[PDB]
Amino acid sequence: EDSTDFNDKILNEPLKHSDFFNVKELFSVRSLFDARVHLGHKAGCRHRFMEPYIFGSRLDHDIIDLEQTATHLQLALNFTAHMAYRKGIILFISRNRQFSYLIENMARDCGEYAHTRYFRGGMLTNARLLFGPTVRLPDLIIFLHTLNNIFEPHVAVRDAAKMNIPTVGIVDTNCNPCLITYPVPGNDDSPLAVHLYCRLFQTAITRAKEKRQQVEALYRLQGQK
């Protein structure tokens, strides 16, 4: 009786709006350009599945089309916010050791989880044996870097798909985005770009959690009276 009204006013309501959390106000094509998000690797490193997202090559240096980055980033931030709103477990992953400390702090600050260390075989596909039969796996995995330190795809991309966990991922011009659910073409090397990503996801997640509390609190006050 009361459960259907709960799920209808709290869980189904936000899914009826194109931008319920107003994540489009967090960035612009200019702010992405100032953070050097458009700078890609040299043409000799290009991955074939990244050609659709490449604006061109400026003196053998691939340029990422920020017009597509903005549309992909909008979808990725929107999905992340809805998952945080629904109280999902969000796990950030990245083997780039220059940003390990930054990413672990960002995860602790937004109330989520980080795994920037060596990824042991079976953390996801054998979790019930490694953690316990009642362990809950992440509802969303966000790759700030999709490659491991030998320039191969992070093993967790394949294993997240095996466990049917949606993935958000920053994909540089040398990355493979085929199995990434919500890919975002962009620079994953420059500190300005990585810092921007961390601010956007952290802000999107923090807003969505505050929105969930505002809606719940309002739903309870109106319930009594």
Partner: protein, 49 residues
């Protein structure tokens, strides 16, 4: 023997933000020591083993 307490609550959310590494205590210590080495940079035997 000293046993480690529950690592997640009733809702299933782990308590520690480094839970999914499988070594949250070890990496939580490496993170704290690494953070102190950074702050020092921003600012700047016989009887023990």
């Amino acid at each position: 023997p000293r046993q480690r307490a529950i690592q997640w609550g009733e809702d299933g959310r782990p308590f520690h933000y480094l839970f999914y590494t499988g070594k949250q205590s070890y990496y939580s210590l490496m993170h704290d020591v690494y953070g102190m080495l950074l702050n020092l940079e921003k600012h700047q035997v016989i009887g023990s083993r």
